[PDB]
């Protein structure tokens, strides 16, 4: 790795996020606000994604 | 068993319906057999596929 190297040979930092979705209890989550829960009424729900 | 011919008919119909319901559990090559999961995980560009 030298600064004069061609772009194809320039260093690149790589991060690979691996995550199984909607399978088991989840701990990591995105930015959202948990609202109240309503029973016996038809609702558009979103539980943990 | 005397009325098997009738029972058969009933049974046959049931099987048909049952299989149809279970056919909802197949991916058919998609990434998930659940429409809600695909809609929750992908944007329209690939959710359409």
A–B: how many Cβ contacts below 8 A? 7
For residue B41, count CB atoms less than 10 angstroms from its CB and return exposed for 0-12, middle for 13-18, buried for 19 or more: middle
Look at the block and give the residue holding tokens 């690939």.
B46
Do residues B33 and B27 touch, judged by C-beta distance below 8 A?
yes
Cα angle for residues A12, A2, A5 (degrees, 5° grid): 75
What tokens does B48 get?
A: 């359409």
The number of angstroms, rounded, from the C-alpha of A11 to the middle of its chain's C-alpha atoms is 26
CA–CA distance, A45 with B38 (Å, rounded to integer):
15
CA–CA distance, B14 with B36 (Å, rounded to integer):
27
Chain A: residue whose CA lies nearest to B34: A22
Nearest to A49 by CA among A12, A24, A18: A24
Do residues A48 and A29 touch, judged by C-beta distance below 8 A?
yes
Chain A: residue whose CA lies nearest to B40: A49
Chain B: residue whose CA lies nearest to A21: B41
Do residues A41 and A14 touch, judged by C-beta distance below 8 A?
no
DSSP string, A1-49: --TTS-GGGS-----------SSS------S--------SS-----S--
Resolution in Å, one decimal, please: 2.8
Do residues B15 and B7 touch, judged by C-beta distance below 8 A?
no
CA–CA distance, B23 with A16 (Å, rounded to integer):
35
Q: How far is A49 from chain B (nearest CA, A)?
A: 7
Q: How far is B37 from chain A (nearest CA, A)?
A: 8
Q: How far is A22 from chain B (nearest CA, A)?
A: 8
Q: What are the helix and strand counts (H, E) for chain B?
A: 3, 0
């Amino acid at each position: 790795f030298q600064p004069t190297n061609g772009v194809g040979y320039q260093p690149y930092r790589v991060v690979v996020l691996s995550f199984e979705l909607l399978h088991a209890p989840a701990t990591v989550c995105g930015p959202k606000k948990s609202t109240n829960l309503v029973k016996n009424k038809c609702v558009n729900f979103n539980f943990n994604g | 068993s005397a009325l098997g011919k009738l029972q058969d008919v009933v049974n046959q119909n049931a099987q048909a319906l049952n299989t149809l319901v279970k056919q909802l559990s197949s991916n058919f090559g998609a990434i998930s057999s659940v429409l809600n999961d695909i809609l929750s995980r992908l944007d329209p560009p690939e959710a359409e596929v």
